[PDB]
């Protein structure tokens, strides 16, 4: 992922303009090869027209240039691009929201699975490790970077996510389908065992744990669904054909004709179609947005950082359920115990922007 929200915190004079100077995850890094290809074909065709072609053939070539320029439609391709890219962006954001995150699970576990002893600590750590393991399994199924990090289940075992005995139980299961759901079933069994053993004190807490487990598992299933069910291939081919047809039309129809013929709208030759190159940037980059977001778990610069999320979730969940279990500072009175109003101070840098009348409603200025 390429984060630039710090740069665009305000609508400045040169806000979006300086974003064109970035390289990592930029339009240039995605297009420059197609840009050089389009420029190469355009320059080769222009050179052939200027030198190689006969005078007789040049009249036919320029008539074909006029014909190809008449059918260069830039408006209709904008519709198919807008709709297709909007669908791809919707899928991309929903895919990000489906990342297996264990924050809800860690909060429930640390608040419901009890015991300062070795067994309670084993319960909490193993409950969160099961969710981490199912996250790792689904992500290595869907993400190329995680797969290269965990090429085999042996890599998962050496990483500490799954144990030797859990590995034997995992491989002995007779199923031809992806087994990312297995640690979730293990989580359900372990939660039921903890409730039976009294580690979970109340019936509500067990229900809350299974509700939060099914939310986590549904996110894993949703990542599998997005991975399996692509954007329909026919629609992707339609947008690609529209864009490539328009650019093939622009390659010939926008060729610089000899001004000596005096054809209208073609009485100039700048030997570089800079406005056609700007249109190429526009439409080719608009397609490149979808081409980068269509599978957001690849190795694009703007693709999701799945390995970082795995590491963060594992470390934070272990910290929260093990070192932070029932480890609280003693209850004491805050700065505003005796104060009628509870208001924090402002720094010298924020006071002169703040201290303004508080909004009470639209109807109170009558």
């Amino acid at each position: 992922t390429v984060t630039y929200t710090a740069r665009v915190a305000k609508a400045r004079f040169g806000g979006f303009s300086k974003l064109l100077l970035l390289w990592r995850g930029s339009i240039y890094k995605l297009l420059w090869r197609e840009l050089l290809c389009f420029l190469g074909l355009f320059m080769a065709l222009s050179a052939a027209y200027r030198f190689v072609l006969t005078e007789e053939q040049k009249r036919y070539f320029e008539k074909l240039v006029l014909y190809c320029d008449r059918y260069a439609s830039l408006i209709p391709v904008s519709f198919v691009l807008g709709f297709y890219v909007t669908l791809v962006v919707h899928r991309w954001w929903n895919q990000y929201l489906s990342m297996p995150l264990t924050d809800a699970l860690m909060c429930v576990v640390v608040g419901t699975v009890h015991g300062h002893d070795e067994r309670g600590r084993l319960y909490r750590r193993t409950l969160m490790r099961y969710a981490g393991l199912s996250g790792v399994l689904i992500l290595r199924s869907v993400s190329t970077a995680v797969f290269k990090r965990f090429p085999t289940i042996d890599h998962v075992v050496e990483a500490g996510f799954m144990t030797r005995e859990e590995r034997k139980k995992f491989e002995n299961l007779n199923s031809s389908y992806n087994k990312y759901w297995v640690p979730c079933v293990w989580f359900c069994n372990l939660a039921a065992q903890a409730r039976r053993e009294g580690r979970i004190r109340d019936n509500g807490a067990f229900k809350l744990l299974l509700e939060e487990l099914n939310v986590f598992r549904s996110k894993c299933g949703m990542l599998f669904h997005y991975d399996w069910i692509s954007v329909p291939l026919v629609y992707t081919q339609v947008v690609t054909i529209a864009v490539y047809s328009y650019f093939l039309a622009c390659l010939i129809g926008r060729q610089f004709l000899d001004p000596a013929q005096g054809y209208k709208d073609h009485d100039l030759d700048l030997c570089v179609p800079i406005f056609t190159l700007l249109q190429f940037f526009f439409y080719a980059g608009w397609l490149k947005v979808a081409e980068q977001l269509i599978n957001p778990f690849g190795e694009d610069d703007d693709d999701f950082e799945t390995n970082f999320l795995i590491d963060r979730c594992f470390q934070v969940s272990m910290l929260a359920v093990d070192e932070m279990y029932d480890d609280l500072a003693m209850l004491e009175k805050d700065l505003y115990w005796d104060a009628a109003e509870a208001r924090a101070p402002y720094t010298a840098a924020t006071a002169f922007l703040m201290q303004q009348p508080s909004f009470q409603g639209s109807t109170f200025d009558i």
Partner: protein, 371 residues
């Protein structure tokens, strides 16, 4: 006949025990008194649930009231050694088993854990495992066994061992309550049975590693006394509560090391036993709180016991001083059972003697200093 306290309405107490106690936590400090066989306890309030034994403060008591000191400097100190969940008060309340120290911070005379822990740390790599079969007899407040006819005897022994029915098992309610109370507390209780003597019972503690054997058995004894106090009966660990053709109570100790548990560990079992063969008198003195006089009434060689004056070992020998189980002989590995220790033995003394003789190759009539 049960005690006057047992006749107080238990319903009432429960009603008070059902009150939510709030943020304060009760800790019951348990220690061994000056007889080396009696347990004492008292309770303090803590601000919060202790996460480990390290968070428990040291405490103190008057040693002149526990047969443990005399004169001016009778204040003794309690140092927490092992923590357990309180089965009488429930979570988050704790049972705190403590070592006893004199006013000058020297170990108390009945503090055998202090030396026992040092010996266990010396052989930690060999990982010694222990198990103890604690036999006990339930008694009425009149000093007669629980359930026996008034000033009389039940039928002869034969049907009571592992018996079921109103005429076979006496005071099983206490046994069930104790078993559960120990499981809740985190005591390593391995099982129970009705013994050959009616109103006599047994619970197994183990396997426990090193110093954990003494902590688990002593706290298991405390819970039994406290559970029996609720029912208004007495648990006695007297090695021979009733004279005649009525079984004694022993504390059979199972011992194994990492070498003995491994394949072909029988050779190490036999080496340990032949070392024990040469120190029978040293172990008899250690296996009894008063030097072996109590166990003289039990070790008569008649009622599935051995002779106190003679040492013997064998495979599947119930009458021997040391027994190698038949399965251990067949599998050529496992443990051996020391059947000598009395029911009122100190487990710290018993475990320390086994390690000194079998693992540290100690000889003579006195324990080695610093080794």
């Amino acid at each position: 006949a049960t005690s006057a306290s047992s006749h107080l309405n238990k319903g009432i107490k429960q009603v008070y025990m059902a009150l939510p106690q709030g943020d304060k936590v009760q800790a019951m400090y348990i220690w061994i008194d000056g007889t080396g066989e009696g347990l004492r306890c008292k309770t303090r309030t803590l601000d919060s649930e202790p996460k480990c034994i390290e968070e428990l403060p040291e405490w103190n008591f008057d040693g002149s009231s526990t047969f443990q000191s005399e004169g001016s400097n009778s204040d003794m100190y309690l140092v927490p050694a092992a923590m357990f969940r309180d089965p009488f008060r429930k979570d988050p309340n704790k049972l705190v088993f403590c070592e006893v120290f004199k006013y000058n911070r020297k170990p108390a005379e009945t503090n055998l854990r202090h030396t026992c822990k040092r010996i266990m740390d010396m052989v930690s790599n060999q990982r010694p495992w222990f198990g103890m079969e604690q036999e006990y007899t339930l008694m009425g407040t009149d000093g007669h066994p629980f359930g026996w006819p008034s000033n009389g005897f039940p039928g002869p022994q034969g049907p009571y061992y592992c018996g079921v029915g109103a005429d076979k098992a006496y005071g099983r309610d206490i046994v069930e309550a104790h078993y559960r109370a120990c499981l809740y507390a985190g005591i390593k209780i391995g099982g129970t049975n009705a013994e050959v003597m009616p109103a006599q019972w047994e619970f197994q503690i183990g396997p426990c590693e090193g110093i954990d054997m003494g902590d688990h058995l002593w706290v298991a004894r405390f819970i039994l006394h406290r559970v029996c106090e609720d029912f208004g009966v007495i648990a006695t660990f007297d090695p021979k509560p009733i004279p005649g053709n009525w079984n004694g109570a022993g504390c059979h100790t199972n011992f194994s090391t990492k070498a003995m548990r491994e394949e072909n560990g029988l050779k190490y079992i036999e080496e340990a036993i032949e070392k024990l063969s040469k120190r029978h008198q040293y172990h008899i003195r250690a296996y009894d709180p008063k030097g072996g006089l109590d166990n003289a009434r039990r070790l008569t060689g008649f009622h599935e016991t051995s002779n106190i004056n003679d040492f013997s070992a064998g495979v599947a020998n119930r009458g021997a001083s040391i027994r190698i189980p038949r399965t251990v002989g067949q599998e050529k590995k496992g443990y051996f059972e020391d059947r000598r220790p009395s029911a009122n033995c100190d487990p710290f003394a018993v475990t320390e003697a086994l390690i000194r003789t079998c693992l540290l190759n100690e000889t003579g009539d006195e324990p080695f200093q610093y080794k």
